[PDB]
């Protein structure tokens, strides 16, 4: 099962009477719910996303400079102008230059000098943003029976059910097929102002980079780059990527400040890299709180025959699950369907079953079936799947 | 080098790398272009005055200067 | 004169007997030497340069990444290898990935994962260096009579003479034409270890940038970029522009860290921008110390007739030079050649000449001539070029 | 998707964007390619194992998996 493989796997084992269970589901983790007389379900937060979020401002990583003009006046001849100063598509610098007879001035002294350049952006050199809205986010919670039954014929996950919630629609009932019904009441807890969360992307170039990053809107708005709203004619703060040279008598050179990709990516080291799946923009981190209702969950294959004790084989012998439980898979040569006779005993006590089953009524189906998961006390145990045995030593405490 | 008399009285010399360290005659005057970073014509350009130096004066801190012709401007691209 | 136009202009006015003068000539400045019974000379440090300096190491501003391979082993199956680890043209990362049954491992636990990528450099994305050698530097010192005589016929500077020195050859005698001879003994003082001075250039791209920068070798060698010596097969420290992604079961993505041009140019803000004139690499700042010998300097046009007092016109009337001296140009309608009758008087003293001439024997040549420069006492003066007068008020003290 | 049996026993599937969410038959086995960031073939490539999943097992944390065929490797370019 997908859940058995995760580092962040939590267990919730209800009592004979428990019908409501409160859970925090984090992105990238899972929870295995076990309830007596009920099957085990794997519940997990699959995604927190918004489709088509509002675009923020866009930034310029590399300025395209052009049509540089320099105007100069002589000492006491007033100031030098260029119309480009009261224009938005430009960057300008007023300075003074040393003037004299050998550069057409009747006076030796400082004279006015102005240089202007036309600032735009290079093709594919923008950093774009999208901001979230709590009113528009969607969060997907998945439920699947913990049986380890996969349809490796059409590569389909059997019994997997998806519940989609919004801030308004935050209640659901999922029908787990022949296992009955599970109710979920999930409240999203962002902890972070979604309206203050930005997803940042960079226009694709030849180099291979992460998809996007999840940044705080505070920070994103403080980037020292020219910016604009998609549709705007010119870039605001275009002067951030320009450097003016020392003025000569009537000439003053205008230089570029380089490609800021490296600068930005240095800042983004240690920032969580986020995913985009078409129109779906994903929050890299978050969690949700559910009240899981198990009352309508029924045990599958109760009236099935018990599997013949001698028809078992080890498909996968007892191994540590990585969560202080033992996992295994059996192959049953006999006639299907049927209930597996599984138990475990601690050395010295043949008559006492010590197996606290995570898969409560293991059955061999005419399709899948055969996976058993159990919690065993520390020490030397023997695991029995009918007459089929295997010794297991259980490590003390937890290595977590 | 091409010379054009832009209707607003003004005159503009558009030079290239080949035009470096050469004399160009504009109207009754002549201009000398000494600009070292010149290239082919493009968007990456620089435009500034080509100073009229009074007869028998040493030009100083200028890489484009004229004699006997006023209001001359220099433009060049930095491509190639 | 070029010298009259400079912010950093110094005066050296020798006495009747002085024949040797000690001077510090800085790049970008000039010195006007005045000696009694001798003409005035403009001496200046024109350049400190080295032709074809030894190349330093080259750095990579933008890495070209390719042929990414990922190798993985299962828990307890030992380590994952790729030959690319003991190779120089690559960057590698050893990590551990979560493994289990659903990713071909019989055990659940961390398994070895290695990712390797081929690191090279993008076309035109290198920063190159050249270092200086005191044994190979050349320094050019210019001498020109301070007369303001220019051949605006063939656009040639009349009387300008260039002396080239090296650490060995540091003595010279320049023949100033009809003005005699000036001897120079110049010792270069770098103050900075030339062998610890680097000139940095960046490979030309579409953006317009400064030519080069003069940096300290200490700093240049500490740049956090991959580097190599021209000719080397691979880049050293190629790992400086690579970022490995979170390992998945058997896959681990390798990303680029962007174009470092912006990063480098941010560091170079406030660094002196240096010039390169073909094979000539120029030190942006420096100075030299000369012992200037004036003994063999003779006064030109001593036996010339005195210009007719009434044949003068103001070409350029008295104006402040910007160095507490008054400059002017006259047009002489009479017959050439001749010596100009120039003097100045302070109001109340018609009989006393107060003009301390910076151009000691002004003459009207059959070509050029007519420029006068003088130091006048503070207050109301009258300047006379023959019968041609002009009032001049002289500012008190100095505004320097 | 092209399949080649590199002489060192090994097998290599070279896939593109068109090959995403498809089944490819290799030898007696079959492999499923789920890799989303695929493009045209080039230098900007990624090569890794296409895991053999034991019959009737759910693949986990893999975007390329095989059944009934061992030692399969996936390579794709990220251009276009």
Author numbering:
A (entry chain A), C (entry chain A): 1 to 400
B (entry chain D), D (entry chain D): 1 to 80
What does the paper say about this structure?
The flavivirus envelope glycoproteins prM and E drive the assembly of icosahedral, spiky immature particles that bud across the membrane of the endoplasmic reticulum. The immature flavivirus particles that bud into the ER lumen display prM/E protomers in which the pr moiety binds at the domain II tip to cap the fusion loop, avoiding its insertion into the ER membrane. Maturation into infectious virions in the trans-Golgi network involves an acid-pH-driven rearrangement into smooth particles made of (prM/E)2 dimers exposing a furin site for prM cleavage into “pr” and “M”. The flavivirus particle’s life cycle includes three key steps: 1- budding into the neutral pH environment of the ER lumen; 2- transport across the trans-Golgi network (TGN), where the pH is mildly acidic and where the particles undergo a maturation step before exiting to the neutral pH extracellular environment;19,20 and 3- entry via receptor-mediated endocytosis into a target cell, where the mildly acidic endosomal pH triggers E-driven fusion of the viral envelope with the endosomal membrane. The fusogenic conformational change of E is irreversible, and the consecutive steps outlined above require a special particle maturation mechanism in order to avoid premature fusion-triggering in the acidic TGN during exocytosis.
